[PDB]
Each structure stands twice: as structure tokens, then as C-alpha cells.
Design an enzyme around this catalytic site. Sequence first.
Site, PDB file in Angstrom:
ATOM      1  CG  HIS A  41      -2.218   0.633   1.048  1.00  0.00           C
ATOM      2  ND1 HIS A  41      -3.271   0.044   0.132  1.00  0.00           N
ATOM      3  CD2 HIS A  41      -2.586   1.773   1.779  1.00  0.00           C
ATOM      4  CE1 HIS A  41      -4.370   0.654   0.336  1.00  0.00           C
ATOM      5  NE2 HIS A  41      -4.217   1.809   1.312  1.00  0.00           N
ATOM      6  CB  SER A  67      -1.594  -1.620  -8.113  1.00  0.00           C
ATOM      7  OG  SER A  67      -2.244  -2.594  -7.309  1.00  0.00           O
ATOM      8  CE  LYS A  98     -10.294  -5.317 -16.056  1.00  0.00           C
ATOM      9  NZ  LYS A  98      -9.332  -4.231 -16.670  1.00  0.00           N
ATOM     10  CG  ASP A  99     -11.693  -7.728  -8.774  1.00  0.00           C
ATOM     11  OD1 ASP A  99     -10.707  -8.048  -9.193  1.00  0.00           O
ATOM     12  OD2 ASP A  99     -11.292  -6.967  -7.677  1.00  0.00           O
ATOM     13  CD  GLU A 103      -3.099 -33.484  -4.995  1.00  0.00           C
ATOM     14  OE1 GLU A 103      -3.455 -34.371  -5.902  1.00  0.00           O
ATOM     15  OE2 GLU A 103      -3.825 -32.777  -4.558  1.00  0.00           O
TER      16      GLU A 103
HETATM   17  C1  HEM Z   1      -2.994 -16.074  -0.750  1.00  0.00           C
HETATM   18  C2  HEM Z   1      -2.260 -15.794  -1.636  1.00  0.00           C
HETATM   19  C3  HEM Z   1      -2.338 -14.688  -2.027  1.00  0.00           C
HETATM   20  C4  HEM Z   1      -3.370 -13.514  -2.152  1.00  0.00           C
HETATM   21  C5  HEM Z   1      -4.772 -13.346  -1.593  1.00  0.00           C
HETATM   22  C6  HEM Z   1      -2.812 -12.300  -2.690  1.00  0.00           C
HETATM   23  C7  HEM Z   1      -3.749 -11.122  -2.795  1.00  0.00           C
HETATM   24  C8  HEM Z   1      -3.166 -10.135  -3.792  1.00  0.00           C
HETATM   25  C9  HEM Z   1      -3.808  -9.065  -3.967  1.00  0.00           C
HETATM   26  C10 HEM Z   1      -5.274  -8.699  -3.745  1.00  0.00           C
HETATM   27  C11 HEM Z   1      -2.895  -7.932  -4.622  1.00  0.00           C
HETATM   28  C12 HEM Z   1      -3.405  -6.878  -5.167  1.00  0.00           C
HETATM   29  C13 HEM Z   1      -4.146  -7.010  -6.437  1.00  0.00           C
HETATM   30  C14 HEM Z   1      -3.358  -7.601  -7.528  1.00  0.00           C
HETATM   31  O1  HEM Z   1      -2.337  -7.582  -8.240  1.00  0.00           O
HETATM   32  O2  HEM Z   1      -3.748  -8.694  -7.909  1.00  0.00           O
HETATM   33  C15 HEM Z   1      -1.664  -8.539  -4.520  1.00  0.00           C
HETATM   34  C16 HEM Z   1      -0.796  -7.976  -5.139  1.00  0.00           C
HETATM   35  C17 HEM Z   1       0.495  -8.491  -5.205  1.00  0.00           C
HETATM   36  N1  HEM Z   1       0.809  -9.920  -4.753  1.00  0.00           N
HETATM   37 FE1  HEM Z   1      -0.316 -11.164  -4.033  1.00  0.00          FE
HETATM   38  N2  HEM Z   1      -1.408 -12.605  -2.998  1.00  0.00           N
HETATM   39  C18 HEM Z   1      -1.262 -13.641  -2.482  1.00  0.00           C
HETATM   40  C19 HEM Z   1      -0.068 -14.721  -2.746  1.00  0.00           C
HETATM   41  C20 HEM Z   1       1.159 -13.907  -3.656  1.00  0.00           C
HETATM   42  C21 HEM Z   1       2.322 -14.530  -3.840  1.00  0.00           C
HETATM   43  C22 HEM Z   1       2.817 -15.819  -3.493  1.00  0.00           C
HETATM   44  C23 HEM Z   1       3.123 -13.398  -4.285  1.00  0.00           C
HETATM   45  C24 HEM Z   1       4.603 -13.366  -4.690  1.00  0.00           C
HETATM   46  C25 HEM Z   1       5.430 -14.555  -4.940  1.00  0.00           C
HETATM   47  C26 HEM Z   1       2.307 -12.078  -4.218  1.00  0.00           C
HETATM   48  C27 HEM Z   1       3.002 -11.200  -4.602  1.00  0.00           C
HETATM   49  C28 HEM Z   1       2.224 -10.131  -4.927  1.00  0.00           C
HETATM   50  C29 HEM Z   1       2.864  -8.600  -5.554  1.00  0.00           C
HETATM   51  C30 HEM Z   1       4.316  -8.366  -5.810  1.00  0.00           C
HETATM   52  C31 HEM Z   1       1.646  -7.975  -5.781  1.00  0.00           C
HETATM   53  C32 HEM Z   1       1.865  -6.383  -6.242  1.00  0.00           C
HETATM   54  C33 HEM Z   1       1.428  -6.528  -7.655  1.00  0.00           C
HETATM   55  C34 HEM Z   1       1.242  -5.465  -8.145  1.00  0.00           C
HETATM   56  O3  HEM Z   1      -0.017  -4.929  -8.221  1.00  0.00           O
HETATM   57  O4  HEM Z   1       2.064  -4.797  -9.083  1.00  0.00           O
HETATM   58  N3  HEM Z   1       1.188 -12.491  -3.824  1.00  0.00           N
HETATM   59  N4  HEM Z   1      -1.960  -9.789  -4.064  1.00  0.00           N
HETATM   60  C1  HEM Z   2      -5.392 -22.603   1.965  1.00  0.00           C
HETATM   61  C2  HEM Z   2      -6.389 -23.481   2.507  1.00  0.00           C
HETATM   62  C3  HEM Z   2      -6.382 -24.900   2.223  1.00  0.00           C
HETATM   63  C4  HEM Z   2      -5.770 -25.543   1.227  1.00  0.00           C
HETATM   64  C5  HEM Z   2      -4.913 -25.345   0.194  1.00  0.00           C
HETATM   65  C6  HEM Z   2      -6.220 -27.039   1.738  1.00  0.00           C
HETATM   66  C7  HEM Z   2      -5.876 -28.059   1.092  1.00  0.00           C
HETATM   67  C8  HEM Z   2      -6.381 -29.313   1.178  1.00  0.00           C
HETATM   68  C9  HEM Z   2      -5.929 -30.466   0.564  1.00  0.00           C
HETATM   69  C10 HEM Z   2      -5.378 -30.853  -0.764  1.00  0.00           C
HETATM   70  C11 HEM Z   2      -6.644 -31.440   1.202  1.00  0.00           C
HETATM   71  C12 HEM Z   2      -6.857 -32.740   0.527  1.00  0.00           C
HETATM   72  C13 HEM Z   2      -8.385 -32.837  -0.154  1.00  0.00           C
HETATM   73  C14 HEM Z   2      -8.808 -34.313  -0.589  1.00  0.00           C
HETATM   74  O1  HEM Z   2      -8.294 -34.759  -1.565  1.00  0.00           O
HETATM   75  O2  HEM Z   2      -9.798 -35.003  -0.271  1.00  0.00           O
HETATM   76  C15 HEM Z   2      -7.337 -30.990   2.296  1.00  0.00           C
HETATM   77  C16 HEM Z   2      -8.010 -31.847   3.285  1.00  0.00           C
HETATM   78  C17 HEM Z   2      -8.857 -31.290   4.354  1.00  0.00           C
HETATM   79  N1  HEM Z   2      -8.747 -29.928   4.603  1.00  0.00           N
HETATM   80 FE1  HEM Z   2      -7.910 -28.677   3.655  1.00  0.00          FE
HETATM   81  N2  HEM Z   2      -6.935 -26.840   2.795  1.00  0.00           N
HETATM   82  C18 HEM Z   2      -6.969 -25.615   3.371  1.00  0.00           C
HETATM   83  C19 HEM Z   2      -7.579 -25.163   4.355  1.00  0.00           C
HETATM   84  C20 HEM Z   2      -8.435 -25.787   5.255  1.00  0.00           C
HETATM   85  C21 HEM Z   2      -8.833 -25.372   6.369  1.00  0.00           C
HETATM   86  C22 HEM Z   2      -8.767 -23.987   7.048  1.00  0.00           C
HETATM   87  C23 HEM Z   2      -9.387 -26.503   7.118  1.00  0.00           C
HETATM   88  C24 HEM Z   2      -9.962 -26.318   8.487  1.00  0.00           C
HETATM   89  C25 HEM Z   2      -9.974 -27.470   9.199  1.00  0.00           C
HETATM   90  C26 HEM Z   2      -9.208 -27.674   6.290  1.00  0.00           C
HETATM   91  C27 HEM Z   2      -9.594 -28.903   6.711  1.00  0.00           C
HETATM   92  C28 HEM Z   2      -9.250 -29.947   5.777  1.00  0.00           C
HETATM   93  C29 HEM Z   2      -9.766 -31.161   6.159  1.00  0.00           C
HETATM   94  C30 HEM Z   2     -10.587 -31.572   7.448  1.00  0.00           C
HETATM   95  C31 HEM Z   2      -9.518 -32.068   5.206  1.00  0.00           C
HETATM   96  C32 HEM Z   2      -9.622 -33.776   5.032  1.00  0.00           C
HETATM   97  C33 HEM Z   2     -10.782 -34.056   4.408  1.00  0.00           C
HETATM   98  C34 HEM Z   2     -10.795 -34.026   2.975  1.00  0.00           C
HETATM   99  O3  HEM Z   2      -9.792 -34.558   2.502  1.00  0.00           O
HETATM  100  O4  HEM Z   2     -11.732 -33.671   2.355  1.00  0.00           O
HETATM  101  N3  HEM Z   2      -8.404 -27.110   5.156  1.00  0.00           N
HETATM  102  N4  HEM Z   2      -7.204 -29.748   2.240  1.00  0.00           N
HETATM  103  C1  LIG Z   3      -8.662  -5.909   2.620  1.00  0.00           C
HETATM  104  C2  LIG Z   3      -9.826  -5.950   3.288  1.00  0.00           C
HETATM  105  C3  LIG Z   3     -10.126  -4.705   3.832  1.00  0.00           C
HETATM  106  C4  LIG Z   3      -9.885  -4.623   5.398  1.00  0.00           C
HETATM  107  C5  LIG Z   3      -8.636  -3.420   5.519  1.00  0.00           C
HETATM  108  C6  LIG Z   3      -7.343  -4.601   5.631  1.00  0.00           C
HETATM  109  C7  LIG Z   3      -6.833  -4.527   6.884  1.00  0.00           C
HETATM  110  C8  LIG Z   3      -5.594  -3.767   6.922  1.00  0.00           C
HETATM  111  C9  LIG Z   3      -5.631  -2.109   7.565  1.00  0.00           C
HETATM  112  C10 LIG Z   3      -4.861  -2.027   8.529  1.00  0.00           C
HETATM  113  C11 LIG Z   3      -3.567  -1.392   7.826  1.00  0.00           C
HETATM  114  C12 LIG Z   3      -3.312  -0.002   8.022  1.00  0.00           C
HETATM  115  O1  LIG Z   3      -3.807   0.665   6.853  1.00  0.00           O
HETATM  116  C13 LIG Z   3      -3.438   1.595   6.844  1.00  0.00           C
HETATM  117  O2  LIG Z   3      -4.682   2.728   6.939  1.00  0.00           O
HETATM  118  C14 LIG Z   3      -4.391   4.144   6.752  1.00  0.00           C
HETATM  119  C15 LIG Z   3      -5.962   4.459   7.106  1.00  0.00           C
HETATM  120  O3  LIG Z   3      -6.803   3.351   7.347  1.00  0.00           O
HETATM  121  C16 LIG Z   3      -4.249   4.292   5.145  1.00  0.00           C
HETATM  122  O4  LIG Z   3      -3.896   5.813   5.166  1.00  0.00           O
HETATM  123  C17 LIG Z   3      -4.542   6.250   3.667  1.00  0.00           C
HETATM  124  O5  LIG Z   3      -5.656   6.592   4.011  1.00  0.00           O
HETATM  125  C18 LIG Z   3      -6.154   7.717   4.606  1.00  0.00           C
HETATM  126  C19 LIG Z   3      -7.611   7.954   4.301  1.00  0.00           C
HETATM  127  O6  LIG Z   3      -8.174   6.929   3.586  1.00  0.00           O
HETATM  128  C20 LIG Z   3      -5.208   8.937   4.818  1.00  0.00           C
HETATM  129  O7  LIG Z   3      -5.172   9.320   6.012  1.00  0.00           O
HETATM  130  C21 LIG Z   3      -3.645   8.526   4.364  1.00  0.00           C
HETATM  131  O8  LIG Z   3      -3.135   9.825   3.888  1.00  0.00           O
HETATM  132  C22 LIG Z   3      -3.464   7.455   3.410  1.00  0.00           C
HETATM  133  O9  LIG Z   3      -2.306   7.058   3.305  1.00  0.00           O
HETATM  134  C23 LIG Z   3      -2.718   3.516   4.800  1.00  0.00           C
HETATM  135  O10 LIG Z   3      -2.373   3.726   3.702  1.00  0.00           O
HETATM  136  C24 LIG Z   3      -2.824   1.973   5.305  1.00  0.00           C
HETATM  137  O11 LIG Z   3      -1.838   1.447   5.082  1.00  0.00           O
END
Ligand code: HEM
Ligand code: HEM
Ligand SMILES: CCCCCCCCCCCCO[C@@H]1O[C@H](CO)[C@@H](O[C@H]2O[C@H](CO)[C@@H](O)[C@H](O)[C@H]2O)[C@H](O)[C@H]1O
Lengths: 124, 85, 244, 71, 54, 383, 61, 56
Positions: free
Chosen positions: F202, F206, F228-229, F272
Amino acid sequence: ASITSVVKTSELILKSPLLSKIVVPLAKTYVKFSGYRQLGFKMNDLIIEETPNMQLALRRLPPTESYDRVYRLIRATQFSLSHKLATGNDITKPEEDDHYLIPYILDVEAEAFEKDALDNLEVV
Amino acid sequence: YMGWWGHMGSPPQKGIAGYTISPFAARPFAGVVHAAIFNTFRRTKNQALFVILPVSFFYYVWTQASEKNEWLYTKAGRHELAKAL
Amino acid sequence: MTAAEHGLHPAEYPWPQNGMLSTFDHASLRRGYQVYKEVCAACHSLDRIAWRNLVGVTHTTDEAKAFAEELEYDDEPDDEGNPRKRPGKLADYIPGPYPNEQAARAANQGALPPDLSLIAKARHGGADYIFALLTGYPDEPPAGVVLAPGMNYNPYFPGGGIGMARTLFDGVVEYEDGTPATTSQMAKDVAAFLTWAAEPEHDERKKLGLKAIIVISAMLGLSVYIKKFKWSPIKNRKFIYNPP
Amino acid sequence: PDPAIALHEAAAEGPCHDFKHHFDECVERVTKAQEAEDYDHAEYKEDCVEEFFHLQHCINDNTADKLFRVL
Amino acid sequence: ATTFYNVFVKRNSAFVATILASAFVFDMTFETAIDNFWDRINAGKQWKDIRHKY
Amino acid sequence: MALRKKNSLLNMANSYVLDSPQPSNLNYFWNFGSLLALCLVIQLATGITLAMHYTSHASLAFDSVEHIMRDVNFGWFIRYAHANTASFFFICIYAHMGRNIYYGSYKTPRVLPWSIGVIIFLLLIITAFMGYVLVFGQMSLWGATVICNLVSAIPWLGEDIVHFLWGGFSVGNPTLQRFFALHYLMPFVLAVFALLHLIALHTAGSSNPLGITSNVDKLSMHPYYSFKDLITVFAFLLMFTLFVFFSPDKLGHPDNYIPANPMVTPASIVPEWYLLPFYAILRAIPDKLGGVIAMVAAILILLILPIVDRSIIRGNAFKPISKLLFGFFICNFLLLGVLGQVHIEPPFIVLGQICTIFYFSYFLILLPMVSTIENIFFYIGSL
Amino acid sequence: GKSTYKIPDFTPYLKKDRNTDANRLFSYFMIGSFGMLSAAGAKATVQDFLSNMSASADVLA
Amino acid sequence: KNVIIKWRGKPIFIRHRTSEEIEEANEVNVATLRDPQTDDERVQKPEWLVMIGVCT
Ligand code: HEM
Ligand code: HEM
Ligand SMILES: CCCCCCCCCCCCO[C@@H]1O[C@H](CO)[C@@H](O[C@H]2O[C@H](CO)[C@@H](O)[C@H](O)[C@H]2O)[C@H](O)[C@H]1O
Ligand code: HEC
Ligand SMILES: CCCCCCCCCCCCO[C@@H]1O[C@H](CO)[C@@H](O[C@H]2O[C@H](CO)[C@@H](O)[C@H](O)[C@H]2O)[C@H](O)[C@H]1O
């Protein structure tokens, strides 16, 4: 990499007749295929600016150069989001692709690098 | 490197007039058919080599490797397999 | 690996359930249960299936209760704590032919017949593999194959030598609906039944999937309209620049 | 009787004839080679599984749909 | 169109009430429609189609 | 002042989802971040629900999963949703990382979100690996055995560490119960790191496909990127629907429907699909410890992209040679994936080694060379 | 090119009936349909999903 | 005779080797052996071949 480096290496190549004979034509095709001119950019508009040195160089641009750069960035952003290319006068012609920023960044970096050297001087 | 609304960190802007029209006043799908055909064709044509060259190369490598592997494990490939191990 | 080590790949047969919108043929499921019960159940269990599972799929409540009530299951001990038996109920699981693995292997020359409740999901090929295997015992093994003792040649089985002999022969079962019980017909029915046993949610799942596909597609189309509508002021924006 | 028997026979004599002949020739070779003495002390004993697979794969391609149509 | 706008769309309370009521109708009618269509494309195959024999 | 700005809690949400200033030209590859958030939400909801029906004891685990499939109302859907969304999670994460590498999102000033992102990716791998073991089928057991035995390579203490991880002398009940507890926890840790990488982002905002500043031209996150999302959310849900309802086992291994049996070894033990490239890299090095190091290095080497990219320009949109090299790097990564699941036989042994060299040489040799030369071509070509 | 009072050409996009109730009503019909399917989809999702917590088939047996 | 004992999930082959079996094993020149070892290195008691019964 620093702009200083890029400029110095380029000057070594341009000096060598052989090297320039083979590199200059390649560089010209590279620029044609790069395609930044088709979004109305000049080459220097693309340089990364989120650094202290570059922020200082941009602050030293003359106001008119600065206002024109802002317009080219906004215009290119609008082409990008619309998935269109520039047409007509918006396309940057090769003669308009001037290095407006290079002299400013070279001066900023000159001082920055001299400061680094002089921080490491040893009284002999 | 980013501020917020009112102080985003842009160099001073002057001299640009921007114009637009309401979403209710515009046809959202204006020029869609031209875009879908001609614009997509242009965009795809210009990027095609960057996809085709690596995909075609690595598919060919795989195809050759998989066919050799298959042949080595037939009767005909007995001798060549013996040498390969 | 040699093709023999992999096993021959089964043909893709046109099952009734192939097809995004297609259920099982329940008449085939019922006939397949009868092949299970009269042929496979001598060596193979179906431990994940309870009598209640058949009800409204292959059988009515009364038919399934009658099947359960013919068997004896372990009850809770009596008042002196001595063991007792009870007749089966719909909640009971279909009982297997052997008490343990050791007994199962002793009856099958060392091989252990797997439980068949998940076999359609536990093998590459599914119904096609079961059909191909049951119908794919050649009269004679290809010249040069040396079978281990107690093994039978079947090209679909990896390595070729399977401990299960051919079991389906024309007329081993007499179907109750008058269908000719040929080897091919019985293999098709029992493969369908075993596929149902592995995935009994199949019919419901594919119908819910049709509803989801329709709703999600409509929502996708509308989301495109709405995105374009909201973005049009940005897409349509125009500039006039007069350099200061 | 089993519809598959007829369908399989027809497909072997017809669209899969090249493969049928390959398998047949293989069988002839292997049986003759087994007949010859000092076969048991040979390094490489040929089988006909490969040829059999080629034939069966072919029969199945020409039969699978036909067979399920008559069940 | 003015009338329709004024009654169902202008107030967001009314717009949301109309959307929710429509969702309720859609849900009930779509259920019935899909059920019938599913039964026609899979005719003679389902338990309900053979149940009468037993 | 508007409440969304004045109240500190509302203002945090406001800053991330509503007034957040975005570039006006993000393309559809900027939508994977919200898809990854969606996958995380689905995995939390389905995972917590499965935990209400699953039993972690080795005598009951596999059967509790069959009870979910057979008896729990909609249990088949919750199970298939959870198992398929694990694959979709990796497709989206590879797309998101590929976007980041192509557009130079790792460059200053975004080194910190990128570096935390690399840890997110490691946590996703661990999370998914432990979850796969919980089924306690044949692939569950044998995959756990082979992967956990890589730790035996750690010198001196490796064997002791493995026995400590297993809680015994082989993969068994203690291992399964601990993997359940950690599999439940790890997604919460992952959500925290996901939040951290966004807070780190932040400060710069982006990046955008042109690689230039967007400080000149910002759009509010809402309503533009919200709507758009929704398009990609519904596209994702269509793909989800096709797998979950029409082909729920296409991405799985049939051997995981056989209960774990420590005696019988499956014909091929593979991870996998989403782990396959890293497994091919490990096979390429003949040494055990060598192989483990290479495999870990293949992920940690992402941390040096900020250094080895010497370009004065951010991203590949205007760099034809970098775009070709990126294309080869991606296709090589897919080939490594394929080689991860072939048998260890000629000629795939040597091919896997050559692909492994190409993988590393992208970071160490090619990207530094190409990015240096392109700097010179931009300068000379535009003089 | 110079005068800012000469509005750029928007004729390729402008609707003639832009101020009418019919025009707005159409766009709200699209938004409303979208909201309607999202409501029906959410309801279906929540109902089918939460039903996992009601007595399972083996318990009811 | 040869037994199969599970030990840490792995099978253990226990063979009660006869005199002539021990002799047969002690013959092969160590030189010509992928893995060069004599029975005395393997067993601590010639009548008890104890091994981990998974193929290498
Ligand atoms: C649970 C996994 C992740 C979530 C939910 C997540 C979510 C996001 C989101 C919402 C943004 C801002 C919107 C976008 O650019 O798509 C973002 C930006 C970014 N993420 Fe992730 N992310 C994840 C994993 C990762 C991983 C594995 C990497 C790097 C190895 C990564 C690197 C970045 C970077 C560098 C940006 C900034 C890109 C830009 O806007 O230029 N994230 N991520
Ligand atoms: C990033 C989040 C997660 C990933 C990538 C993930 C991935 C997986 C995968 C690959 C399996 C094997 C599924 C199958 O082939 O049957 C699995 C099984 C399972 N996961 Fe997760 N999991 C996640 C989050 C969670 C969370 C938060 C829970 C909370 C308990 C959970 C509970 C389970 C359970 C109980 C199973 C075994 C039953 C089954 O195979 O369906 N997982 N998970
Ligand atoms: C993604 C799901 C939504 C939940 C929010 C994610 C939780 C993370 C928030 C806590 C991190 C603190 O986040 C921080 O907040 C302040 C105000 O809120 C932001 O501050 C920004 O906005 C405010 C007004 O909107 C201005 O005063 C400031 O000049 C500007 O930088 C920071 O840019 C951000 O980094
Ligand atoms: C009297 C013994 C016997 C009968 C009858 C029998 N089987 Fe088997 N079956 C076995 C044995 C033993 C194996 C294990 C074979 C092996 O693993 O070598 C087996 C294995 C199988 C396999 C798995 C092969 C594999 O891929 O592992 C399937 C499927 C199968 N049987 C289905 C059937 C069906 C369907 C029927 C009858 C309609 C049937 N069996 C009848 C003894 C029998
Ligand atoms: C704040 C939200 C309010 C509380 C949420 C309510 C939680 C649970 C409510 C009902 C859940 C069970 O409600 C029940 O659901 C299932 C679908 O899921 C329906 O069942 C219907 O469809 C399913 C498959 O979709 C079929 O197996 C079934 O034969 C059919 O009748 C029942 O017709 C309904 O009675």
C-alpha cells in the site's frame, strides 16, 4: 542498473567503428519492435522513477518538459486501458524521441557517486 | 511513493482538459463488433510469436522424448534400452 | 515401462451415465446388484453400502428390508452378558464373505479380493476398466507369457497375471426382468452398479450442476454488461492538451 | 449367445486384419522357439504380448460402440 | 416506464424488496422447470420410471 | 468528514477496498489477487465444515472421509469443493506470480510485498501437502513417507528430525493427528501473511501493465475494480462448477481411494500436480542433500529477482527479448511439471537435468545478461 | 486541439434518449436481474451448504 | 522357511537357513556383486537371515 552505467557502456560501443556498425542497426530494430512509440511515449518516459535520484531529476525538469511528460503518461495510460494504439500525431516519430531526462539524471547521479567516493577518501 | 487523494504525488498538472459522458448517456457496447473482430485480431497477431515459438519448441522436445521413451520399452528397442541403462 | 507392466488401456464404452445431463440407468443398476449378489459377493465385500442405500435407487423399502431381515447380525449382549444375534435392519451394512483378510487370502490362493465399494474410483478407467477386465480373459494367454501359479492371464490387469479367474459366463445369472444374461450384459450391468456404489450422489450432483451452470452463466453475462456500463465513462474519456 | 464373440471375430478378420496376422506370425515364431531345445537356458525369451495389445486395441476401437448398442 | 420506475426502482427499499421477491419466485419456478426437464431427458432411466414394476 | 474516513476501523476498510487509488489501466491479470482471496475464503469455509465431520485418528480418517461423501448432507459437494479449490488455488497463484514476474512487480519499490509473497507461496505448499495426507489413502501415506524422508538429508540430525516430525518410526497415527492440527492452523497463518503483503504494497500502490507511475491518473478501487473483479469471479465459478459437479475426480489420483497400506507400495509415488516442477528439480540432482537444496533454492531464488533484473525499465511490455525469454522460462516450468510425473527412465532423466539448468540459468545468467543488453538497445536505439 | 469549449466528439457513443425513464429503467433491469440471481444463488448456496449440519443419513437411520 | 514380520510398517524376512543354504551363500566371490558383501557381514548368526523385505 544506473543510467550512468548505461550511458557509458553505450558510448564505448558508439566509439568502436566495428561495434557501432553491428549494434546501432540492431538497437534501431529493437526500438521499432518495442513499440513504446505506438503509445505516444518517448523512451525516457519509461525509466523507473520510484527512487530518490530519479525523483530529484524529475523535480529539476523545466516546467514545460514536466507538463508535457504528465500529458504523455496520461495519454498512454488511456490508450492502455482502452486497448488502442496511438494514431497520427500521437505516434512518437523518431525525431521527437529526445532524451529530455538523461542530462538531469546524469547530474544527480554524478553527485551521488562522487559523494560515495569522497565518503571513502583516505588522507595520504 | 504514493500519497492519497489531493496529494497523490503527481508532478503538477496543467493544460489538460478531460471530458467524459455519463454511463446512462452512453451505449456501453458501442463498437463492440468491430472491437471483437478487428481489435482482437490486431492484438493477437502482434503477440502471436511470443507464444507460438516457446510452445512449439517445448512441445516438440516433449514429443521426441516421449516417443523415444515409448520405443525403448518395446521389443524393437531392447538393445538401445540396454545401452541407455 | 513396458505396455504389459501398465496393462492394456480399456476402450471408452458409451455408458448411459456418460453425458453432462445423463443419469444412471436404474434398471441396469438393479440387474447389476443381482450380479453382485450372485457372483461377486462370494469373494468380494461391499462394506460401504447399507441396505437403506438401495432404497429408491434399485429397490423399494420392502424389498430391501426383506434382504436385511434374512441375515443375522451381532446384537448387544443379553442380560447375563452372553453374545446374541438379531435379524438385519435397513441401517445395517451389507455383510462381506470373509471374517478377516487372512481368511480371505486363504480362500483365494493368497490373493486378497478388494472391497468393491470404491473400486470404480480407485482404478484408472472406472466402469470401463471393470467392464474390460471382466470380459477380457482370452481363452489362451499370448504365446510366451509364463503365469505364476494361481494366476490367470488378463491384459487389462497390470503385469497380465491376475489372481481372479473368469467368473462371468453366459447364463450364470437369471435376470428377474427377462434380460438375456450374456457375459457382456452382466459385465455391463455390474460395472454400472459398482460405479453407482462408488459415487451414489452422481445423479443429484449432475442435476444441481446443470442449475449452477445456468445461473452462473447468466450472472457472467450480466456482470459483463454491468462492468461495461460502469466503465464506459473511463473508456470514453477524451483529452485536449494545450501545453502551458 | 454373447454378441461380443461375433463382433470381435468380424473386426479381427476385417479392419484389424494386419494386426491379426502380426499376432498370428508372432505366435508361430514363439511356439516354434519353445519347441527347440536349450530354450529354457536362453537369455531372451520372446512373448507376443505387444502384438496382442496392438490387435486388442484395434478390435476395441471397432467394436466398443457396436457392442453397447446391442445391450 | 415512469410509473414502473417510480414504484419499483426509485426507492432503494422498494428496489431491494422487488429483487428479493423476484428471487423467491425465480427460485421456486426454476426448481420446478429443471425438475421437469431433467425427468424428460432421462426418461425411463430413473427409479421413479421403473418403480411401478415393484 | 464522511464516516468512512473519520472512524478508524471503517477507514482501514475504506483504504483497501473503496477509496484505495488504483491505476486506471489494470488488465485482467490484476484479477488473480481477488481470485486468490476467494479461494482462501472457500477453503476456510469448506475446510472448517469438513473438520466438523472428519476424524483425525488413523483408524477412522479414511472412513470419515467416506462418511462425508456418503452420509453428510451435501458432504460430497463440500469435499469436492475443498479438493478442487486446492488445485484452483495453485492455478491462481502461479498466474499471479507469473503476472508479477512479467510486469516487474518485484522491482523497487515493491521488493517487500514480493518477498513476503514468496513466503506465502511456501506456506501454501506446506498447507496443501498436509491436507492431502489427511485422507489417509495410499497416495496420502506414501507421499508423506517420501517427502518427509527428504529431511533425513539434513546432516547429523536429519534422521532424528524425521522421527520427531512423524512422532514415531514411520508415518502413522501420530503423524496424521499432528498434520490435522497444523493443516487447520496454517491457512490462518497464510491469511496473516497475505494481509501483510498487501499492507506492504500500500506504500507504493499497485504497479500497472505499462510499468510507469500511475500517480498521474488514479481510479477508486470501488466501483471500478469491484465490478471488474465480478467478471473473473463468475468465470472462476464456472470452471469450479464444471469440475466440482461434472468431473470431480479429474485432478486426483485413483490410488487415494485405496486405504493407506504400509506394506503395498504404489506403482508410482508422485506429488499433486502443482508440486511436480519442484519434484523434477529434485530428481535432477543425483545427491540426496544436493537435490533437497536445489528444490528449496528453486523457490528461494525468486528472492533475487530484484537484484538480477538490471533493467532501467519496469516490466516486459516494451521489451521484445525479455518477452521471449519469459516465454521460454514459463514453458520450461511446465515441462519440468510434466517430467515430475514420468517414470525415471531414458530419455527423461537427462531432459530433466537440462530443464533444471535452464530454470536456474534464467535467474543467474540470462535475465542479468538480457536486461543489461536491452538497457543499451533502448539508449542507442532512441538516440 | 486548442479550444477547450469545443467538446470532443461523443456522437459514436451518445444515446439520443438518454434523459428518459425508459433509458434508466433498462439499466436498472440489468442491475436488478443481476441482484436477483445473486440473491437466489446465495440462498441456494447457503441452504445446501448449511444443511451439512443437520442430522446425516446414518444418524437419521 | 522364511517368515515376514512387520516392523515399523516395513516387512522383515526371517529365514531359518539350512547348513547347505549357508554354504551356497558363502560361495559367490564377493568381487562379482553389485553390492559386495559376504553373509558374515549380513548375519550375526548364520542360521538367522534377518532382512528388511522390500526390494531395493
Ligand atoms: C494467498 C495468496 C495471495 C493473495 C490472496 C494475494 C492477494 C493479492 C492482492 C489482492 C493483490 C493486489 C491486487 C493484484 O495485483 O492482483 C496482490 C498484489 C501482489 N501480490 Fe499477491 N496474493 C497472494 C500471494 C502472493 C504471492 C505468492 C506473491 C509473490 C510470490 C504475491 C506477490 C504480490 C505482489 C508483488 C503484488 C503487487 C503486484 C502489483 O500490483 O504490481 N502474492 N496480491
Ligand atoms: C489454503 C487453505 C487450504 C488448502 C490449500 C487446503 C488443501 C487441502 C487439500 C489438498 C486436502 C486434500 C483434499 C482431498 O483430496 O480429499 C485437504 C483436506 C482437508 N482439509 Fe484442507 N486446505 C485448506 C484449508 C483448510 C482449512 C482452513 C481447514 C480447516 C480445518 C481444512 C480442513 C481440511 C480437512 C478436514 C481435510 C480432510 C478431509 C478431506 O480430504 O476432504 N483445510 N485440504
Ligand atoms: C482488504 C480487506 C479490508 C480490510 C482492510 C485491510 C486491513 C488492513 C488495514 C490496516 C493497515 C493500516 O492501513 C493503513 O490505513 C491508513 C488509514 O486506514 C491508510 O492511510 C491512507 O488513507 C487515509 C484516508 O483513507 C489517509 O489519512 C492517508 O494519508 C492514506 O495513506 C494507509 O495507507 C494504510 O496502510
Ligand atoms: C471366487 C473369487 C472371485 C469372484 C467370484 C470374483 N472375484 Fe474379483 N477378484 C478376486 C481376487 C482374488 C482378486 C484379486 C486379484 C489380484 O489382485 O491378483 C479380485 C480382483 C477384482 C478387481 C480388481 C482387480 C484390480 O485392478 O485390482 C475387480 C474390479 C474385481 N475383482 C471385480 C469382480 C466382479 C465385478 C466380480 C463378479 C461379478 C468378481 N470380481 C468376481 C476374486 C474373485
Ligand atoms: C440466515 C440463513 C437462514 C438459515 C439457513 C437455513 C439452514 C438449512 C435450511 C434448509 C436446509 C435443508 O432444506 C432442505 O434443503 C435441501 C437442499 O439443500 C432440499 O432438498 C432438495 O434438494 C436436494 C438436492 O438439492 C435433494 O437431495 C432433495 O431430494 C430435494 O428435496 C430440501 O427441499 C430442503 O427441505
